[PDB]
Write a protein that binds this DNA or RNA. Structure first.
Length: 462
RNA sequence: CCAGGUCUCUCUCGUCGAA
RNA sequence: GUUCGACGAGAGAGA
């Protein structure tokens, strides 16, 4: 993805966007108990911690496009993936305005406590001034649809969140692109039946993990993979996507009965963004905050492995490839081992910079012992081998607890951590419970015991 | 005082409804 | 007491 141009807003006719410069993360009563290195990431340009220039570094993700045409491999992959997607047999209908607004079977409601996007943000209007979950009133929305129409500029926000050290002084913060209420609704009316069918079909069929619940679905996964495994990591997936991939996506969309709306995709590689007092244009790159960015990023990953397979292993049957993607994250298998190192090579020739799985330094064979999905390991239960635990290493469960946004929520924060932590096992779980109860409000919490989480975990298959 | 995207899953709270 | 459902708000994690 390339920035095509960028200039002061006041002379493109777009308003100056004012954004907060103070983080909402204060240290917690557990800050000095556990250990960890992550500070809140950089928000403004004057941050005392900075090594480099701010603005220069956060837009650095926009690599520059690489391809423009869909080649014979991409074209091939398209038919296979689309071919595969066909068995799903998924409703091609437009979704009605009421649904796409207020939720329906497979799709939640719009998020009524987040920005409404341009123009509303600057006109002083929140989603709740337009939406009402009780009345379920379209109309006033339909108005603002007819006024402002669609294809509006995104509002670019710095993401308020904890981040490693090397990435703070290096100013490698993350950017949010707030979709306009108007486009979210439009997008959902066009694709909110596609959305629902990926949501209810996570697996090697869709090649997507959206909708799945790792507590349960971790057991279905070994079953679905083939013999030898392969996997990698990406350096800035969303921003490295060249427009040609949007074309391969649209072909797949065309193939399965979405012909009409497939020009909506164009609104994604070509797009306009508002950032404080400037305005800019970007060609390529999937923007953060659109509707469906989760699902589209997955589909394109499914296409990236099929292409890079065909390319690098000349003569290969794609029907024996089982994968699941969650955006750029992915778990992947094959009958015979494949060399992720080769793909990474024959792959920068597509704009994608690939690396080894789990911040490794060398493409090592992928085993059920060192593989991760959604930052969790796989470990079979001692007493019941067929039931797999998703295991998140305590390292960054630690990092999350040393910090809060509102101490009034400490009970809920920590109890969520416990539901993640216990899969490490009774020892480390109680070990953890011990360091929590060693400050006054630690002792006061209401925390479950290993036995209670283990019982319930098992019951949840019954 | 507020400001800060799209989703997915879970948990907690509050409402009405259930022998 | 607790369970169960529907519907609203909060929060955590993951992409």
């Amino acid at each position: 993805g390339e920035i095509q141009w960028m200039r002061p807003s006041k002379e493109v006719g777009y308003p100056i966007i004012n954004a907060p410069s103070k983080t909402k993360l204060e240290p917690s009563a557990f800050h000095y108990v556990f250990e960890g290195v992550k500070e809140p990431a950089v928000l403004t340009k004057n941050d005392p911690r900075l090594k480099t220039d701010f603005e220069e570094a956060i837009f650095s993700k926009y690599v520059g496009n690489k391809i423009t045409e869909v080649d014979e491999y991409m074209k091939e992959a398209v038919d296979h993936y689309a071919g595969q997607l066909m068995s799903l047999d998924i409703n091609t209908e437009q979704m009605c305005l009421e649904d796409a607004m207020y939720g329906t079977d497979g799709l939640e409601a719009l998020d009524l406590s987040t920005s409404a996007g341009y123009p509303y943000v600057a006109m002083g209007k929140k989603k709740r001034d337009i939406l009402n979950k009780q009345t379920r009133d379209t109309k006033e929305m339909q108005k603002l649809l007819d006024t402002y129409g669609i294809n509006l500029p995104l509002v670019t926000y710095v993401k308020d969140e904890l981040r490693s050290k090397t990435k703070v002084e290096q100013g490698k913060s993350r950017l949010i692109e707030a979709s306009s209420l108007n486009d979210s609704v439009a997008m959902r009316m066009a694709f909110g039946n596609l959305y629902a069918a990926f949501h209810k079909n996570p697996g090697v069929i869709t090649g997507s993990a959206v909708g799945c619940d790792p507590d349960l679905f971790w057991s279905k996964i070994p079953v679905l993979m083939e013999e030898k495994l392969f996997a990698f990591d990406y350096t800035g997936y969303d921003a490295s996507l060249s427009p040609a991939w949007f074309e391969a996506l649209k072909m797949v969309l065309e193939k399965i009965g979405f012909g009409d709306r497939v020009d909506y995709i164009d609104y994604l590689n070509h797009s306009h963004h508002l950032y404080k007092n400037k305005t800019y244009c970007v060609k390529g790159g999937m923007p953060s905050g659109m509707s469906g960015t989760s699902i589209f990023n997955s589909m394109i990953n499914n296409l990236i492995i099929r292409t890079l397979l065909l390319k690098t292993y000349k003569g290969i049957d794609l029907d024996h490839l089982k994968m699941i993607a969650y955006g750029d994250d992915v778990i992947a298998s094959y009958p015979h081992e494949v060399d992720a190192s080769l793909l990474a090579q024959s792959g920068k020739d597509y704009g994608l910079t690939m690396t080894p799985a789990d911040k490794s330094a060398t493409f090592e064979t992928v085993t059920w012992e060192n593989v991760t999905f959604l930052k969790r390991f796989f470990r079979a239960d001692e007493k019941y081998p067929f039931l797999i635990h998703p295991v998140m290493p305590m390292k960054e469960i630690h990092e999350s607890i040393r910090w809060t946004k509102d101490p009034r929520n400490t009970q809920d924060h920590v109890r969520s951590l416990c539901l993640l932590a216990w899969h490490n096992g009774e020892e480390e779980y109680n070990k953890f419970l011990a360091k929590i109860r060693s400050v006054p409000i630690g002792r006061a919490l209401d925390l479950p015991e290993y036995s209670t989480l283990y019982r319930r975990w098992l019951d949840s298959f019954g």
